[PDB]
């Protein structure tokens, strides 16, 4: 006579959802096979005085129900004052922590803050190495990204980026082009520790929200050095190994790095109307530069298809599209050539922004979140990744963030997050015919989510190759 | 072919669930017709240093989806150290805040702290008056309860309780009886304010946990005055008006109060084998005593059936049962006589206990929670409230707390809360055949939940008449 919600869960598989809660100050794991929250953690319990739990990624576990490990970072300072919420906190913590947490089959356990171990605090995207032997974090206030060792939480390499605008004026600093410096960032304290915890290193006093390139150009973003900003977001991994790619929002480029040899090798040019690449220029053993005549649009970077045949960058605002490179040549990223642009008549405005993504296992389809300011419904675009065309767009609700996929490729699991003060939820869409199956409650402001991987292969469609 | 979860929600109707999250430091409202969280609020955002979000009740609204108001309180101090979380904040905020929040159709808005307005902080149960013109909070650390005005947040009346044991040793303080004093509490500061915020007034350093009556007896509960504790839990309301009833856990009695005339009128005796009542004695205009010759069990849950015909008190631990009084005579509570005890051959351990309940609208059935420490399954017992017998028990999961019911009587909606560190969920149970329909994720440590009522009549089976 009645509908049992267990019928719904039974179809989804034995998969563990995990998501951080931004202004909620919490992180939680959900058993998609029963509807239960498996465990949750509230960072205030651990003396965190600004627990804006931002991005996260989970290491593969042979059985997530028995144990898994993940990394979740935080933001602080003036980031608390940027959303609809009329916060009253007199001395907010500086954030930039990088928490290591273990789910032990019962509870979450805080292991340590890797930003205390390493000395390097970073507050934007978190990713796992395809070898699951490490992770990487980027930050758009300090414009630094690094890869860390999983066992020691020490930095393997760190890169710092800087902008030298042709026109020394915030309105023109990126439109009229400039030179970005890529610099090896080396520790300064005993035990090879950085002195870059919390706010140390910040060029701007908060992260740029969606459309923040207008904000920083309009002088609406305070900081000691906003003319030097490039707004690094992420370091994502070629699933085939060897390379990692850092995105830079304001100059509208990506930098391909040799992981092991600790050098940049190529610069991918984001906007439609640019060549495939810009010329990388070595200045000395630790310093490279790239000249960018004009920045046509800011962008956000997407990441690799699961076979590493394709690499994708989102242009944002001035252009809204998905730029696509042929990355088939694993030997030499300087040969990576533009092969498609995903466009739509619906993307001609300032919004929606092409935001985050997840590929199906076979690389044939992508699911892409489409972001708008309140009150326009955000939703998901379904992309044919063979022909590079939009197949379908579905309206869902306010403030769409990230997507993950069950590893059998059957269901996409997305986060809607209420701009931190209104409706939020988990959405589940089936990928066979692309229908929205409905929503689950989620009293959190997630800017991330993962399903815990089992294998290194699973990581190819997790928080490793894409954000 | 795929099952939609929307099918599950369609059946539930247009009802809004609200629950706070204890250690999560959050409160959230969920739309049972779609699965969305409508809004959530993190008290750390407002500078709360110990946001243990504890009890709540919601005022009726003609359309909860357009707007509703609720009250949610907090606990602080050594309550942060009670649960199995290895908290690191050694000197937490003191809690005892009484937050007024409005859901405005879009977001939750923090209105104010009624404890700051009135000067009275109280940390245990919150209930709404049956007229919806006010609210009540009780507290078991300071042994105070009060009824507050909804517009002004000022105290209408406050009562303080104190224990004078026959035997001056914690082992025998309650078992060997004593005299409980009931004292009218008057404002002591200008503009009609109390000096009783935060820890001011506390006799003990944390709210007694379940079985806590043993710990206090064994000298395991720190405080300046545990020998004089009664552990007030709540002040619940006669749905017929006029009367309010305070529950006292350690002496196992409830005190019935005339709300408008601001005097106690009757003391009901909890344990099986004691008379219906003990004798209330007037000492002066502000002071009553009652002699209790021995205390054979502590007790806890007290409330009314929705027609006010029956009043119930739960005995816990030494005895586990439900004591029932004939409260049909609304003119004179001193006439309220015991009519039944709900007992069960499965309730002979020290656990399960029975800490919460909800009636069906016709008063024919009760849903009651059955609490055990980890790891024994907690769940729901269904009680025939015509014959006073257990119909059924269902096992559900860890740490069951409160229950609410949809106002059409169709669905009981309950909270499981992980002891603050393991699995938590919302459970849905239909009342026609008393089958569990399943679980929804809820990353919160809830010790309370309501469905937002629309009418005064709906309030009779919400957080007004029972806990
Ligand atoms: Cu069913
Ligand atoms: Cu570790
Ligand atoms: Cu990003
Ligand atoms: Cu209680
Ligand atoms: Cu009990
Ligand atoms: Cu509680």
Q: Which residue has 């403030």 as its token pair?
A: A399
Which run of H or of E encompasses B9? helix B6-10
Chain A residues inside the 8 Å CB shell of B105: none
Q: Strand, helix or coil at A256?
A: strand
Q: How far apart are CA B81 and CA B85, in angstroms?
A: 7
Q: Whole-angstrom Cα distance, residue B375 to residue A222?
A: 52
Q: Identify all chain B residues contacting A25, using CB atoms and an 8 Å cutoff.
A: 25-26, 42, 44
Compare CB distances from A28 to B2, B108, B443 and report the shortest one's residue. Answer: B443
Which residue of A111, A430, A443 to mutate against B (max B Cβ within 10 Å)? A443
Q: B334 near B269, Cβ under 8 Å? A: no
B98 in Cβ contact with B73 (< 8 Å): yes
Between the CA of B2 and the centroid of ligand 1 the distance, in Å, is 12
* Domain ranges for chain B: 1-467
Put simply, the answer to whether B24 touches A40 (Cβ < 8 Å) is yes
Pairing type for strands A52-58 and B37-42 reads unpaired
Q: How far is B34 from chain A (nearest CA, A)?
A: 7
Peptide bond preceding B170 in cis form (omega within 30 of 0): no
For residue B444, what is the nearest residue in chain A, using CA coordinates?
A40
* Shortest distance, CA A193 to any CA of chain B (angstroms): 25
**Deposited resolution, Å:** 1.6
Edge-first strand listing for the sheet containing B178-185:
B126-128, B134-139, B144-149, B155-165, B178-185, B287-292, B280-284
Q: Alpha-carbon distance A443 to A449, whole Å?
A: 14
Task: Tell the residue number behind the tokens 């619940």, with chain if given.
Answer: B236
Q: Tokens representing B342?
A: 């709900």
Q: ω before B45 within 30° of 0 (cis)?
A: no
Contacts of residue B290, Cβ cutoff 8 Å, sequence gap at least 6: B179, B180, B182, B253, B255, B267, B278, B279, B280, B281
Cα–Cα distance, A274 to A298 (Å, whole number): 13
Buried b (16+ CB within 10 A) or exposed e, B117-132: bbbbbbbbbbbbbbeb
Chain B contact present for A35, CB below 8 A: yes
User: Who contacts B190 (Cβ-Cβ below 8 Å, separation ≥6)?
Assistant: none
How many interface pairs between A and B have CB atoms less than 8 angstroms apart? Answer: 201
CA A39 to chain centre: 24
Give the list of residues 6+ apart from residue A353 with CB closer than 8 angstroms, or none: A210, A211, A300, A314, A316, A317, A320, A370, A371, A372
The closest alpha carbon to A290, from A179, A451, A203, belongs to A179
Q: Nearest Cα to B163, choosing from B66, B292, B260, B13?
A: B292
**Cα–Cα–Cα angle for B439, B442, B446, rounded to 5 degrees:** 110
How does DSSP classify residue A173?
A: T
Alpha-carbon Rg for chain B in angstroms: 20
CB B232 within 8 A of CB B247: yes
- Using CB atoms within 10 A of its CB, is residue A448 exposed (0-12), middle (13-18) or buried (19+)? buried
Identify the residue whose tokens are 């044991």.
B165
Give the integer Cα–Cα distance in Å for B459 and B359. Answer: 11
Give bridge partners of residue B395 from the DSSP assignment.
B379
CA distances from B108 to A89, B23, B65, B212 (A): 18, 19, 12, 35
| Residue of chain A nearest B4, judged by CA positions | A437
> How far apart, in whole angstroms, are the C-alpha atoms of residue B265 and residue B275?
16
Both tokens of residue A449?
């989510």
Residue among B80, B421, B440 whose CB faces A440 most closely = B440
Q: Do B26 and A24 touch (CB under 8 A)?
A: yes
DSSP code for A450: E
Alpha carbon distance B180, B248 (integer Å): 10
- For chain A, say whether B3 makes contact (Cβ under 8 Å): yes
Does the annotation list B401 as a binding residue? yes
Which of A419, A428, A425 lies closest to A371, judged by CA?
A: A419
- A102 forms beta bridges with A69, A109
Instruction: List chain A gaps (C–N > 2.5 A) by preceding residue.
Output: none
Task: Determine contact, residues A353/A370, Cβ cutoff 8 Å.
Answer: yes
Q: Does the distance separating the beta carbons of A443 and B37 come in below 8 Å?
A: yes
- Distance in Å, CA B447 to ligand 6 centroid: 5
Nearest CA distance, A386 vs chain B (angstrom): 26
Residue A3 has φ and ψ, to the nearest 5°, of: -90, 125
Closest-approaching ligand to the CA atom of A102 = 2
Residue B155: count other Cβ atoms within 10 Å of its Cβ: 23
Phi-psi region of A223 (alpha: psi -120 to 50; beta: other; left: phi over 0): left
Nearest to B426 by CA among B7, B3, B8, B18: B18
Q: Where are the alpha helices (DSSP H) in A345-414?
A: none
Q: Is there a contact between B21 and A5 (Cβ–Cβ < 8 Å)?
A: no
Here the tokens at position B11 are: 């059946």
The alpha carbon of B218 and the centre of ligand 1 are apart by a number of angstroms equal to 50
Which helix (H) or strand (E) covers residue A56, if one does?
Answer: strand A52-58
Strand partners, A333: none
CA of B183 to the centre of ligand 5 (A): 27
The DSSP bridge pattern shows strands A435-441 and A425-430 to be antiparallel
What gap in Å lies between CA A91 and CA B432, rounded to an integer?
53
Cα dihedral A120, A125, A128, A130 sign: negative
Q: In B110-211, where does DSSP find H-type helix? A: 114-118
- Token couple for B329: 């005579």
How many angstroms separate the Cα of A71 from the Cα of each of A157, A451, B14? 18, 13, 38
Q: With an 8 Å Cβ cutoff, are A437 and B4 in contact?
A: yes
Which 388-417 residues of chain B touch chain A by CB within 8 A? 397
Question: Does the beta-carbon distance from B25 to A28 stay under 8 Å?
Answer: no
Ligand 2 centroid to Cα of residue A112, in Å, is 7
Shortest CA distance to B103 belongs to which of B136, B58, B153, B42?
A: B58
- Please answer whether residues A69 and A61 qualify as being in contact, where contact means their C-beta atoms are separated by less than 8 angstroms: yes
| A44 interface with B at CB cutoff 8 Å | yes
Element spanning B26, H or E: strand B26-31
3-state secondary structure of B105: coil
B43/B28 Cα distance (integer angstroms): 11
Residue A222 CB partners (closer than 8 Å, separation 6+): A78, A204, A205
Q: Judge whether A294 and A287 are in contact, CB under 8 Å.
A: no
Q: Which residues pair with A324 in a beta bridge?
A: A312, A340
> What DSSP string runs through B152-176?
T--EEEEEEEEEEESS-STTTTTTT
Helices (DSSP H) in A184-320: which residue ranges? 212-217
If you measure CA to CA, which chain A residue comes closest to B40?
Answer: A443
**Cβ(B159)–Cβ(B142) under 8 Å?**
no
Task: State whether residue A1 sits within 8 Å of chain B by CB.
Answer: yes
CA distances from A364 to A315, A325, A327, A358 (A): 21, 15, 16, 11
DSSP per residue, A244-285: EEEEETTTTEEEEEETTTTEEEEEEE-SBTB-SEE-EEEEET
Report residue B309 as tokens.
Answer: 């015909």
Helix (H, G, I), strand (E, B) or coil at B78: helix
CA distance A449 to chain B (A): 14
Place of tokens 């430091």: B25
């Amino acid at each position: 006579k009645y509908v049992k919600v267990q019928d719904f869960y039974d179809q989804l598989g034995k998969y563990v959802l995990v998501a951080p809660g931004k202004f909620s100050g919490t992180v939680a794991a959900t058993d998609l096979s029963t509807g239960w929250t498996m465990a949750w953690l509230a960072a205030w319990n651990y003396g965190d005085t600004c627990p804006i739990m931002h991005h996260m990624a989970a290491f593969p576990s042979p059985d997530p129900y028995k144990e898994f490990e993940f990394v979740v970072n935080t933001q602080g300072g003036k980031n608390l004052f940027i959303y609809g919420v009329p916060v009253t906190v007199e001395d907010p913590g500086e954030g930039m922590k990088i928490y290591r947490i273990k789910y032990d089959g019962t509870r979450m356990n805080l292991q340590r803050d890797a930003a205390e171990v390493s000395g390097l605090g970073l507050g934007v995207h978190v990713t796992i190495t395809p070898e699951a032997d490490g992770y990487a974090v980027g930050d758009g206030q300090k414009d630094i990204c690094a890869e860390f060792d999983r066992e020691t939480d020490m930095v393997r390499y760190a890169w710092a980026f800087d902008w030298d605008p042709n026109v020394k004026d915030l309105k023109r600093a990126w439109l009229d082009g400039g030179t970005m410096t890529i610099k090896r960032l080396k520790p300064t304290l005993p035990g090879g520790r950085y002195d870059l915890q919390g706010s140390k290193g910040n060029k701007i006093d908060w992260e740029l929200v969606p459309g923040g390139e207008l904000a920083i150009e309009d002088g609406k973003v305070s900081g000691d050095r906003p003319l030097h900003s490039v707004a690094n977001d992420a370091l994502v991994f070629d699933p085939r190994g060897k390379w990692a790619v850092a995105s830079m929002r304001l100059p509208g480029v990506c930098v391909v790095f040799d992981r092991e040899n600790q050098v940049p090798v190529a610069v991918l040019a984001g906007p439609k109307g640019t060549p495939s690449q810009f010329q990388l220029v070595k200045v000395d053993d630790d310093t490279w530069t790239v000249d960018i005549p004009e920045v046509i649009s800011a962008g956000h970077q997407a990441g690799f298809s699961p076979d590493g045949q394709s690499f994708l960058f989102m242009n944002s605002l001035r252009q809204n599209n998905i730029m696509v490179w042929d990355s088939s040549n694993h030997d030499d990223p300087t040969t990576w050539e533009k092969k498609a642009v995903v466009e739509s008549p619906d993307w001609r405005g300032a919004y929606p922004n092409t935001f985050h993504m997840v590929f199906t296992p076979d690389a044939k389809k992508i699911y892409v979140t489409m972001w708008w300011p309140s009150p326009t419904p955000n939703g998901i675009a379904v992309i044919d990744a063979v022909n590079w065309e939009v197949l379908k767009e579905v309206d869902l609700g306010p403030d769409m963030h990230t997507l993950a996929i069950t590893y059998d490729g059957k269901f996409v699991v997305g986060t809607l997050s209420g701009y931190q003060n209104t409706a939020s939820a988990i959405v589940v869409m089936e990928t066979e015919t692309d229908e929205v199956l409905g929503f689950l409650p989620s009293p959190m402001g997630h800017h991330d989510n993962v399903i815990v991987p089992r294998t290194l292969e699973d990581l190819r469609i997790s928080r490793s190759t894409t954000t």
